[PDB]
Design a protein around this ligand. Structure first.
Ligand SMILES: CCCCCCCCCCCCCCCCC[C@@H](O)O[C@H](CO[C@H](O)CCCCCCCCCCCCCCC)COP(=O)(O)OCC[N+](C)(C)C
Ligand SMILES: CCCCCCCC/C=C\CCCCCCCC(=O)OC[C@H](COP(=O)(O)OCCN)OC(=O)CCCCCCC/C=C\CCCCCCCC
Ligand SMILES: CCCCCCCC/C=C\CCCCCCCC(=O)OC[C@H](COP(=O)(O)OCCN)OC(=O)CCCCCCC/C=C\CCCCCCCC
Ligand SMILES: CCCCCCCC/C=C\CCCCCCCC(=O)OC[C@H](COP(=O)(O)OCCN)OC(=O)CCCCCCC/C=C\CCCCCCCC
Ligand SMILES: CCCCCCCC/C=C\CCCCCCCC(=O)O[C@H](COC(=O)CCCCCCC/C=C/CCCCCCCC)COP(=O)(O)OCCN
Lengths: 99, 303, 98, 347, 71, 70, 114, 105, 83, 129
């Protein structure tokens, strides 16, 4: 309820102020007178997507520290971060981070 | 009285960002052996007002061939997200108390790139499209390390609740516990908002401009809450408010200082910077901050 | 089985039908696939939360990660096809025929 | 690609198949399918050219749609019963969705359209892998839930696959499309006995895998992808052509060859369940597969086609690389009929 | 103490629902008052709609979304 | 001189002061002169609900002491 | 299939504990120390019977024991307890940490009296 | 087909996530824990065909707990009859159901 | 030994970020298995009561189970207080 | 009762799905899918899945649809089935999600291997030659 009302107020104020900005100077009269598709940017976007997926895997860490199985969770988190570093290293050594 | 609270949150931010433009020209001017605006108003105090009036009265140059839909949607989304980022923050008490406030801010920052994408696509120009693609790639690249650093820092907090950051830093700032993460976080917040040395790129222009400066001030507030924790007394929150605002002002003046001090990077240079210096160190420090509470038996309480 | 589940299943069916139409623009095919996985995420999350089955709170995350990886793979394939022909039109993939 | 990367990708494909085969949780089976799909694409696109890219994108689209349908079936099954184990399906609608997804993965009719084009686009090694190894996981999943399948739908798609393969193989001159239609027909034969006996399905799978391995390895040895190119094989290596003719006769179900075993056992098992009409139609339709096998044998070994002058240089050279197990596969696909009662091992 | 209060409150709500149900369904021919939908006689925790089904909308909405919407 | 930048910084400081102080004052005003009660974890939400049902005026912040136990 | 049996509204009548959450939190430690036996009897019956309708008498007993505890508190240590729960009610999180002084006052008062 | 590697080696690769009543973290119970437990204990060691034919009562109760079709049907019928009576005008809700009651802790 | 020292000295120059990253990661991997406070962290996690401790039905054969919380029987938390 | 807010959100979800399923002007289809994803996130959040809804809204919207738009730019009844009790002093969803590192070792292993293989596959496919 409160969050819905806050978002609605933000959107309403932004819309009102942008529209008055776009319409206040529209009342007075004036004159009123490709291909390249670089591959590197796509690789940057795909690398961002994959790293974002691995980050999403890393996100439940603050709650995983209270499990009473500390050794197993530490091993698994270190494993995830090690494979993240391995992905970065593989893309580094295969000339995937060049311009 | 919730609408009154919402308005008393929204309006002062716009006034602050309106007077932040006057403070930026003054600080830069004095760093350049000159003065800022000191004619319009007793000390340039009316300069922000004059600029706003002139901008809202100047003709808008609609491309006459662009898609009007995305053209009008982009500033709405930008300003709405910039204003929404403010609600979660605790100064000392948040307008809305969220359990996953930090995650909410991360999600909003993730959305923030759609305005750039839509403005670049609807501009009806190939060069503007190239610039927009370049900016979007830089933004997503740096938000990666923002997220990783943020979770590494929160590993000492115990949750995603923003109010818990005040309790965590009751005796000592988080700056002393992990300063390298703070350094990389500050540089990443520089790169996120397209501030020098990373600034590689009438109405709608005014709207976009307001959104950027509100994002700058919000980044400063989040950084101040995260790394320089002020002591909060439940029977007098005004002290916490004063300390938090002073720290935010100092950090914003620090961005202005950094703008006045340095040249700018190339694009390949900033991509190499991130992907080959910040990401490896961020991963190593994330491993270290995962291991440290277990090694020292200092796991934070909440679960 | 209440009406919300029926609405989500209808959304999944609509996304599947839109995928199987192919007016043009393989990018729209990928968009339909991602709509299908989003519908799957929503409906599985609702099932898991309603029954208080604590241990399957993992599964939506796994589904999201795997489907986004598949999305990246499909995007790469689309980019290669476009670089081959200059456009992502469906009818340009007629070299192989039954 | 790099041999290390190729070996890692092949191991990932095999590990995804094994993960499907050994897991008891539906999510893990879905994960195995996703892993197999993810590692399969570079193997198909190993030799980069527009045809391989088109085949890879067609295969990706089909498999992604099938995986989405399978995930939806799993979620519906979970909704109507809080179970994740691969057992009785527990729901009529969920079962129908799952059966179509597995048929799309296998290429059963009417979801057969992608197999010939994907096989034609890819090379012979990728075709071998796709037509042999990529059938284990869906067939194992179908076997695990064979007590839940509606016999009408399974038998309908099986008979449709047999008819479609028989008719579509008659029109082909390319060898890879012939092999694809043969695979479709054999899949249709395999899935017509799941409602009654899964051991027959596994026996047919083993026999077909052996025969297909022998045929693809022979085709790789004599590097021909068209009928006319294979018609030049007698002028250099007639033994290969004779072995290929024997293998083709075996693949047509002619006794006393090995290929007669699966059809014989499936007919006998289906007759035990008071089913008479369908085995008769199935044999009548397999006659078409035998016909185009005979046409290939006529063009290959039983007659001598004209040659070219430049074969004289090829007469002077020997194959640098010899494929191991080719001899074993030929013998196993030719002369194992007397060992038929060994199927009781639950192969 | 909270457990005891919760049990008493739930039982009271169930009893009031039973009383109003007995009053309302008096003229329905095949209806049975207070009939279970389970074959077992084991106690089953009631749903949200079993306790507030006949109550007003404001407290239905409260008991459903108050904790979620409280920020 | 450099202190001529101070007026703008002071205006910014007051503008940034307004939100937090306003929120704290509204929280004290609408919660009976005390801090707004926070409810994560669904147990202290039940505490708030019980307080509201005990007060008798449908407000949780109306605190019932030992005088009400008779 | 079957009829669900429910106790009458008379069986659910009991003198309720009409103190708020802050008072309960302030008195919780001594309440658990003193009223342990009826509470544990009730909770053992609750996890053994798995039925609320089988545990009403123990609920009435725990209500009575809590009432006796609070009557003793009112009789002997009214004002230190009042100040302590005034603390606990002021805070938004109801933290014990903020006025350990009043906690010490209440603790020494109850130690001297009861 | 199915190669039971887990049962051969006692590995428990994925069995922990199969059912509601299998060792949830912090001992958090499923909504239909008792019904599924009863159904599983009924059908153990009996085989699929016999489990389906003989343990139908437990599975029916489990499905009723899971989807609550019968309960929602009964509540909808009760509410519909109440609406019909209040539209006709022979029934008035008590103060308990009109918000005028006295709440209890 | 000389080759490794030369490699480390050459990597510390012109590549300090990677050297620091590898050092920090290796230390984070190695040290937890050697620190004695990880068992303390596990024990602290054990002592955090999230659930209600359900009492046991007394049958006269449980001398180790306390009858009241103040009884000496049962686990103690004096070690946590001393920490 | 807000006139079945869950029902309204579900209808908006289905309408958005019909909107982008017509496949007009893939940028507009992406906009429709963004709206549908936001509505689904709202549904999950209103149901009680705060963390999973935030995962939708962050990962899906801000990474995957953003990459989709980037690539495109390069080219030319309720409230009744609910529970009765409380959860304790924590959220069951967070506990179940965090159990991934203590219970789901196998899941973590297979997912990490799949992600690394996906990185390698993307590199190999995009080499070209
Ligand atoms: C036996 C054959 C070995 C050779 C063949 C290997 C086949 C492929 C490799 C994958 C299999 C690895 C086995 C791991 C199975 C997971 C279960 C086992 O490890 O026990 C876990 C213990 O976890 C272990 O620490 C996992 C360590 C192994 C992971 C580290 C390296 C993994 C690499 C494997 C291949 C991945 C890619 C290659 C990387 C180089 C369970 O912990 P536990 O606490 O008792 O019980 C949890 C339930 N509770 C919560 C109720 C208590
Ligand atoms: C921090 C505070 C900032 C607040 C934000 C900005 C607030 C905006 C305040 C608006 C001030 C009023 C501006 C009005 C002047 C508009 C510009 C102008 O001078 O136009 C003159 C123009 C010239 O036209 P012609 O001579 O006929 O033809 C010439 C072409 N051959 O004449 C007009 O059109 C007059 C229009 C009527 C305006 C009268 C009403 C004033 C507007 C009030 C503001 C409304 C929104 C609030
Ligand atoms: C329902 C499905 C029933 C399946 C029936 C299978 C019948 C078995 C034979 C099928 C062959 C059909 C294909 C065919 O013959 O095409 C006509 C073909 C075209 O020649 P091609 O070699 O393809 O091209 C040469 C130019 N490049 O013409 C021929 O050569 C005909 C010569 C072969 C005749 C064989 C006689 C078969 C009929 C015998 C009687 C029984 C038939 C089997 C079913 C009978 C009904 C119970
Ligand atoms: C835009 C922002 C959408 C989501 C913002 C709110 C996220 C959130 O967590 O608030 C949920 C909040 C409190 O949750 P907790 O933090 O866990 O703690 C409260 C209980 N102790 O409660 C709510 O769920 C209220 C709001 C839920 C319903 C509405 C959800 C949002 C719906 C938006 C639909 C519109 C999308 C259109 C397209 C968007 C493209 C950018
Ligand atoms: C065992 C721990 C594992 C986990 C920790 C790691 C976490 C994060 C670190 C990994 C991130 C990915 C690493 C990617 C590796 C890329 C290698 C590379 O190609 O770099 C070379 C350059 O660097 C190299 O020479 C390769 C690596 C050099 C060795 C680095 C350090 C090796 C070990 C040092 C520390 C040993 C232990 C520390 C003990 C210290 C005492 C306390 C090429 O650089 P260019 O971009 O082409 O620029 C050159 C043009 N001017």
């Amino acid at each position: 309820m409160n969050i819905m009302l806050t978002l609605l107020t933000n959107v309403t104020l932004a819309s009102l102020l942008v529209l008055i900005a776009f319409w206040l100077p529209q009342l007075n009269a004036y004159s009123e007178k490709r291909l390249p598709f670089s591959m590197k940017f796509f690789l940057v976007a795909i690398t961002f997507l994959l790293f974002d997926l691995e980050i999403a895997l890393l996100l439940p860490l603050p709650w995983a520290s209270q499990t009473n199985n500390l050794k197993t969770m530490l091993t698994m988190a270190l494993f995830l971060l090690i494979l993240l570093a391995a992905s970065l290293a593989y893309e580094w050594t295969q000339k995937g981070l060049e311009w | 009285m919730f609408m009154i609270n919402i308005l008393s949150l929204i309006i002062p931010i716009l006034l602050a960002v309106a007077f932040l433009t006057l403070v930026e020209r003054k600080v830069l001017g004095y760093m350049q052996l000159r003065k800022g605006p000191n004619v319009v108003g007793p000390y340039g105090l009316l300069q922000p007002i004059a600029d706003a009036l002139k901008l809202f009265t100047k003709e808008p140059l609609r491309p006459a061939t662009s898609s009007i839909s995305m053209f009008i949607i982009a500033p709405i989304l930008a300003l709405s997200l910039a204003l929404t980022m403010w609600v979660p923050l605790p100064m000392p008490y948040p307008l809305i108390n969220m359990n996953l406030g930090v995650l909410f801010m991360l999600a909003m920052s993730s959305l923030a790139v759609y305005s750039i994408l839509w403005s670049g696509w609807a501009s009806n120009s190939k060069y503007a499209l190239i610039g927009a693609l370049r900016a979007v790639a830089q933004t997503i690249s740096y938000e990666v390390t923002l997220a990783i650093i943020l979770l590494s820092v929160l590993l000492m907090n115990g949750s995603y609740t923003l109010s818990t950051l005040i309790t965590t830093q009751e005796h000592i700032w988080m700056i002393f516990t992990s300063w390298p993460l703070a350094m990389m976080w500050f540089i990443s917040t520089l790169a996120e908002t397209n501030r020098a040395p990373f600034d590689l790129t009438a109405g709608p222009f005014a709207m976009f401009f307001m959104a950027e400066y509100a994002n700058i001030i919000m980044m400063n507030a989040f950084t101040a809450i995260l790394f320089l924790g002020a002591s909060h007394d439940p029977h007098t929150p005004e002290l916490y408010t004063i300390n938090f605002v002073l720290k935010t002002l100092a950090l914003t003046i620090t961005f202005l200082w950094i703008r006045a001090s340095y040249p700018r990077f190339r694009y390949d240079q900033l991509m190499h910077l991130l992907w080959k210096s910040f990401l490896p160190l961020t991963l190593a420090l994330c491993m270290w901050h995962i291991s440290l509470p277990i090694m020292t038996a200092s796991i934070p309480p909440q679960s | 089985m209440p009406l919300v589940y029926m609405n989500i299943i209808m959304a999944f069916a609509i996304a599947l039908a839109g995928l199987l139409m192919y007016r043009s623009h393989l990018m729209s095919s990928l968009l339909c696939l991602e709509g299908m996985m989003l519908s799957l995420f929503i409906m599985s999350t609702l099932i898991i939360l309603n029954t208080h089955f604590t241990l399957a709170n993992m599964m939506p995350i796994i589904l999201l990660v795997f489907a986004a990886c598949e999305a990246a793979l499909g995007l790469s394939l689309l980019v290669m096809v476009s670089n081959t022909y200059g456009t992502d039109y469906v009818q340009n993939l007629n070299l192989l025929q039954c | 690609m790099n041999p290390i990367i190729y070996t890692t990708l092949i191991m990932t494909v095999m590990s995804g198949t094994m993960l499907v085969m050994i897991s008891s949780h539906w999510l893990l089976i879905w994960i195995g399918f996703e892993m197999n799909l993810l590692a399969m694409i570079p193997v198909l696109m190993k030799n980069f050219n527009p045809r391989a890219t088109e085949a890879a994108t067609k295969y990706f689209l089909t498999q992604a749609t099938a995986s989405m349908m399978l995930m939806m079936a799993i979620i519906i099954n979970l909704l109507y019963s809080g179970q994740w184990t691969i057992t009785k399906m527990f729901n009529p609608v969920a079962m129908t969705m799952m059966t179509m997804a597995l048929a799309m993965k296998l290429g059963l009719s009417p979801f057969h359209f992608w197999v010939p084009e994907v096989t034609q686009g890819i090379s012979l090694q990728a075709g071998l892998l796709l037509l042999t190894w990529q059938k284990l996981a869906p067939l194992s999943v179908l076997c695990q839930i064979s007590q839940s399948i509606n016999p009408n739908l399974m038998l309908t798609m099986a008979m449709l696959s047999i008819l479609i393969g028989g008719w579509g193989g008659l029109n082909q001159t390319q060898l890879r499309k012939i092999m694809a239609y043969s695979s479709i027909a054999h899949m249709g034969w395999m899935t017509a006995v799941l409602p009654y006996n899964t051991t027959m399905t596994i026996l047919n799978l083993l026999i077909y895998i052996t025969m297909t391995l022998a045929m693809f390895m022979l085709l790789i040895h004599s590097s021909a992808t068209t009928t006319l190119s294979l018609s030049h094989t007698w002028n250099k290596m007639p033994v290969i052509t004779s072995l290929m003719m024997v293998t083709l006769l075996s693949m047509g179900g002619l006794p006393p060859l090995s290929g007669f075993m699966p059809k014989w056992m499936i007919i006998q098992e289906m007759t035990k369940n008071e089913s008479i009409i369908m085995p008769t139609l199935m044999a009548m339709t397999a006659l078409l597969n035998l016909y185009f096998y005979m046409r290939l044998a006529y063009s290959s070994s039983l007659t001598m086609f004209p040659s070219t002058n430049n074969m004289k240089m090829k007469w002077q050279f020997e194959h640098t690389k010899q494929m191991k197990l080719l001899p074993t596969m030929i013998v196993l696909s030719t002369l194992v009929l007397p060992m038929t009662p060994a199927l009781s091992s639950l192969n | 103490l909270f457990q005891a209060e919760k049990d008493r409150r739930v039982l009271q709500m169930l009893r009031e629902n039973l009383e109003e149900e007995a009053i309302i369904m008096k003229d329905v021919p095949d209806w049975k008052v207070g009939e279970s939908v389970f074959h077992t006689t084991r106690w089953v925790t009631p749903m949200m709609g079993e306790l507030y089904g006949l109550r007003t909308n404001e407290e239905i909405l409260s008991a459903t979304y108050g904790f979620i919407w409280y920020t | 001189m450099w202190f001529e930048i101070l007026p703008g910084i002071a205006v910014m400081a007051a503008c940034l002061f307004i939100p937090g102080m306003a929120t704290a004052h509204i929280h004290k005003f609408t919660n009976g002169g005390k801090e707004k009660r926070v409810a994560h974890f669904s147990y202290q939400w039940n505490l708030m609900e019980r307080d509201r049902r005990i007060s008798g005026v449908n407000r949780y912040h109306v605190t019932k002491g030992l005088e009400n136990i008779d | 299939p079957g009829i669900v049996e429910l106790p009458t509204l008379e069986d659910l009548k009991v003198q309720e504990v009409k103190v708020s959450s802050s008072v309960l939190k302030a008195a919780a430690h001594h309440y658990g120390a003193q009223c342990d036996k009826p509470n544990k009897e009730f909770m053992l019956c609750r996890w053994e019977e798995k039925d609320p309708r089988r545990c009403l008498e123990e609920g009435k007993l725990v209500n009575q024991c809590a009432l006796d505890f609070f009557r003793q508190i009112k009789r002997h240590c009214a004002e230190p307890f009042t100040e302590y729960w005034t603390c606990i009610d002021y805070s938004g999180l109801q933290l014990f940490r903020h006025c350990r002084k009043q906690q010490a006052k209440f603790d020494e008062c109850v130690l001297d009296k009861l | 087909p199915f190669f039971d590697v887990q049962k051969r080696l006692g590995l428990d690769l994925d069995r922990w996530m199969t059912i509601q009543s299998a060792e949830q973290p912090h001992k958090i119970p499923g909504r239909c824990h008792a019904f599924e437990k009863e159904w599983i204990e009924c059908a153990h060691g009996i085989g699929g065909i016999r489990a389906e034919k003989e343990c139908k009562i437990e599975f029916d109760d489990f499905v009723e707990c899971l989807l609550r079709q019968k309960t929602m049907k009964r509540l909808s019928a009760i509410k519909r009859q109440r609406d019909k009576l209040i539209k006709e005008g022979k029934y008035t809700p008590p103060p308990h159901h009109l918000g005028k009651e006295d709440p209890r802790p | 030994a000389g080759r490794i020292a030369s490699f480390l000295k050459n990597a510390w120059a012109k590549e300090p970020v990677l050297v620091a990253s590898f050092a920090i990661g290796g230390l984070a991997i190695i040290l937890p298995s050697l620190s004695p406070y990880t068992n303390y962290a596990i024990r602290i996690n054990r002592a955090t009561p999230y659930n209600y401790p359900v009492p046991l039905r007394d049958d006269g054969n449980m001398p180790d189970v306390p009858s009241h919380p103040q009884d000496p029987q049962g686990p103690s938390l004096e070690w946590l207080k001393n920490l | 009762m807000t006139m079945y807010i869950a029902f309204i959100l579900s209808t908006i979800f289905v309408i958005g799905f019909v909107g982008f399923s017509s496949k007009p002007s893939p940028i507009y289809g992406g906009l429709g899918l963004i709206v549908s994803g936001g509505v689904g996130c709202g549904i999950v959040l209103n149901f009680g899945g705060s963390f999973l809804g935030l995962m939708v809204f962050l990962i899906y919207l801000g990474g995957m649809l953003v990459v989709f738009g980037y690539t495109t730019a390069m080219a030319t009844g309720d409230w009744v089935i609910y529970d009765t009790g409380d959860s304790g002093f924590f959220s069951e969803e967070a506990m179940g999600i965090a159990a991934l590192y203590s219970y789901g070792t196998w899941l973590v292993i297979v997912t990490g291997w799949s992600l690394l293989i996906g990185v390698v596959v993307i590199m190999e496919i995009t080499r070209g030659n």
